[PDB]
Amino acid sequence: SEEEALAGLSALFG
Amino acid sequence: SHLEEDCVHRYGVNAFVLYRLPVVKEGMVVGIVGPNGTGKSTAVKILAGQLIPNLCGDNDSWDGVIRAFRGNELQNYFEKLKNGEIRPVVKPQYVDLIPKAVKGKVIELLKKADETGKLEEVVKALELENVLDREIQHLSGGELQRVAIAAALLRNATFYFFDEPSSYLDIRQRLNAARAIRRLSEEGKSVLVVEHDLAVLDYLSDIIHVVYGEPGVYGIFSQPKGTRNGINEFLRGYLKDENVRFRPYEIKFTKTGERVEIERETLVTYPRLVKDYGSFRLEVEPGEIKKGEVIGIVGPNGIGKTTFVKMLAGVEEPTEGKIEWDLTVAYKPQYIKADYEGTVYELLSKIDASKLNSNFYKTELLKPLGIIDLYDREVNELSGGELQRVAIAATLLRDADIYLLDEPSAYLDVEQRLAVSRAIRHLMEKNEKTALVVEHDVLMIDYVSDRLMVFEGEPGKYGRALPPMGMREGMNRFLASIGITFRRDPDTGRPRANKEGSVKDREQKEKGEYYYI
Ligand SMILES: Nc1ncnc2c1ncn2[C@@H]1O[C@H](COP(=O)(O)OP(=O)(O)O)[C@@H](O)[C@H]1O
Ligand SMILES: Nc1ncnc2c1ncn2[C@@H]1O[C@H](COP(=O)(O)OP(=O)(O)O)[C@@H](O)[C@H]1O
Ligand SMILES: [Mg+2]
Ligand SMILES: [Mg+2]
Incomplete structure (x- = not known):
């Protein structure tokens, strides 16, 4: 859930 | 340091x-x-x-x-x-x-x-x-x-x-x-x-x-x-x-003089089995399970490995074929959702309190899996990895003729996997019981298994379970479909992968010998 994740994952994909 | x-x-x-x-x-x-x-x-x-x-x-x-x-x-x-x-x-x-x-x-x-x-x-x-x-x-x-x-x-x-x-x-x-x-x-x-x-x-x-x-x-x-x-x-x-x-003992793999070849007695046989789920079909070839052996089960997912284990566990009925057994089964399912208001100690002590107090069980099972440190934890608050280890412990603490463990490595770290391999093997050797283990971790398969059962087919469409066979024949067949070879390491006795294009990989691929013991 941590907002660290949404940053890490979107960088890989977006 | x-x-x-x-x-x-x-x-x-x-x-x-x-x-x-x-x-x-x-x-x-x-x-x-x-x-x-x-x-x-x-x-x-x-x-x-x-x-x-x-x-x-x-x-x-x-x-x-x-x-x-x-x-x-x-x-x-x-x-x-x-x-x-x-x-x-x-x-x-x-x-x-x-x-x-x-x-x-x-x-x-x-x-x-x-x-x-x-x-x-x-x-x-x-x-x-x-x-x-x-x-x-x-x-x-x-x-x-x-x-x-x-x-x-x-x-x-x-x-x-x-x-x-x-x-x-x-x-x-x-x-x-x-x-x-x-x-x-x-x-x-x-x-x-x-x-x-x-x-x-x-x-x-x-x-x-x-x-x-x-x-x-x-x-x-x-x-x-x-x-x-x-x-x-x-x-x-x-x-x-x-x-x-960093660990007070070595994790050793089998060197070639350790395990005696034993012509084991048959525990049970099973005939040809079929399990249909709509358009998916699993066909199981007739096979035999020996007293005191461990059979590793390998294959891609979506193929019927769990389905097979469930039929052995008596929790799923075959569509065609008949399992005629008078055996007690202990079963560690692939997916577990904790639904237990109590501690790990309460759960395991109610299975077998005498084993919890046994030095052999402490040394070979409870300490290596970190179960003692989990004793006063509520089962419903355990993480994936914690619940996995407790479920393996609970399964191995039961008194059964046959122990079925479906993908015990899931959620486990490297150290916990090695511990689980050793525990399965040592407990089955100690108590002269039989196990089947579905696993995707090759070193776990290599450590626990006497024989191997290979599943092949198309995920979601069809699967075929080959009869249990020797480790070499089994791994050769599976690894042929991936194009990767393993040799043996003389120091630790562990399987050692050859990298793509290496000289040993070429030699082995020409001979068709993908796996050594
Ligand atoms: N963002 C964070 N804030 C506070 N503690 C953290 C954070 N991330 C990790 N930790 C702690 O640091 C330790 C090591 O974490 P981690 O590097 O993820 O280990 P590993 O990947 O080896 O499992 C963990 O026990 C964890 O509790
Ligand atoms: N109760 C069920 N109803 C319908 N389909 C199922 C059921 N159980 C398993 N399947 C399907 O049967 C196939 C085999 O699944 P499974 O035996 O879990 O494979 P594996 O354990 O090898 O990954 C899969 O395609 C799965 O979706
Ligand atoms: Mg499965
Ligand atoms: Mg990590």
């Missing part, structure tokens, strides 16, 4: 401290192995530029890091990171969270990530053809993992970091992914990889760091080691140059 200059990061609301970092090198794969809670992902976040390390003080800039690494080959690495000359691509650990961070179809996301024009080649290698039109909300854990690896492989960069890519992948998918990841190093790129599957780590890596310490308290990166020495030192539990004995 524990030097102040080597202190890389301290979490404030935790006090966990990380010492040292791994090397990264263009044209090389650097592998990282160690128990969870020791800073593996922390190191990846730092090298990726996602976390500015505080140097166990109050540093908050890359300038402070660059100065701290004076005279270290990482000094220039961090300068480049600071200036944006490098920007590592990170396949993170937490692939479960992908649906919360990203929306839409899979094909849309891989299109964006395509900076190399190899979309078709990557989709092929990771077998994502049937997933392209799916929306991310409807992907399995394993599909989320492969889409993440795919997106990382498609980016153009110099440094690629993969944190635990084998998670959720079947035996085929993890080995295929390892091959595809390693190909980055042949293109001159740098690869960092954290792995708990030792066969995959071995196959992946040119260089190895062992991470050691106390989970949740501190972790230390070893000096860089060659792949063979590193893994062998990990298994021995002693790092020679560092002079650190």
Whole structure:
């Protein structure tokens, strides 16, 4: 859930 | 050890401290192995530029890091990171969270990530053809993992970091992914990889760091080691140059004089079985299970491995064929949801309190799996990895003729996997009982198994269970379908993967001998 994740994952994909 | 200059990061609301970092090198794969809670992902976040390390003080800039690494080959690495000359691509650990961070179809996301024009080649290698039109909300854990690896492989960069890519992948998918990841190093790129599957780590890596310490308290990166020495030192539990004995005993694999050939008596036979689920069909060839043996079960997922185990467990009825048995079965299911208001101690003591107080069970099962430290934990509050270990313990504490363990390595770290392998084997030897173990971790299969049962077919469409056969014949057949070979390591007795294109790999592929004992 941590907002660290949404940053890490979107960088890989977006 | 524990030097102040080597202190890389301290979490404030935790006090966990990380010492040292791994090397990264263009044209090389650097592998990282160690128990969870020791800073593996922390190191990846730092090298990726996602976390500015505080140097166990109050540093908050890359300038402070660059100065701290004076005279270290990482000094220039961090300068480049600071200036944006490098920007590592990170396949993170937490692939479960992908649906919360990203929306839409899979094909849309891989299109964006395509900076190399190899979309078709990557989709092929990771077998994502049937997933392209799916929306991310409807992907399995394993599909989320492969889409993440795919997106990382498609980016153009110099440094690629993969944190635990084998998670959720079947035996085929993890080995295929390892091959595809390693190909980055042949293109001159740098690869960092954290792995708990030792066969995959071995196959992946040119260089190895062992991470050691106390989970949740501190972790230390070893000096860089060659792949063979590193893994062998990990298994021995002693790092020679560092002079650190991090485990009070060695984890040994079978050397060729250890296990006596025994013509075992038949425990039970089973006839041809069929199980249909709508358009899916599993066909099981007639087979035999011997008294006191362990049969490892391997194959791609979606093929009927669990379905077969369930029929053996008596929780699923065959569509065609008849299981006629008067045996007691203990069953560790692949997926478990805790529904138990009580502690781990209460649960296990009510199965067999006498075994909890037995020195053999403490030594071979309870201590190695970390069960004693979980005793006063509520079962409903256990994590995936904790619940897995407790369920394995609970299963092995039962008195049964046959023990069925479906994918015990799931959610386990490398150290916990080795412990689980030893426990299964030692308890079955001790009590002269029979087990079947479905596993995707090759070193676990190699340690626990006397014979092997191979499943083949098309995921979701059809599966066929071959009769149990010898380890060599079984692994040859399976590995032929992947195109990877293993040799034996004389020092530790462990299976040792040959890297693609190596001389031993060629020799073995010509002879058709994919696996030695
Ligand atoms: N963001 C954070 N804040 C506080 N503590 C953390 C944070 N991330 C990790 N930790 C702690 O640091 C330790 C090591 O974490 P991690 O690097 O993820 O270990 P590994 O990847 O080897 O399992 C863990 O025990 C964890 O509790
Ligand atoms: N109760 C069920 N109803 C319908 N389909 C099922 C059921 N159980 C399993 N399947 C399907 O049967 C196939 C075999 O699944 P499983 O035996 O769990 O494979 P494995 O354990 O080898 O991954 C899969 O395609 C799965 O979706
Ligand atoms: Mg981690
Ligand atoms: Mg299964």
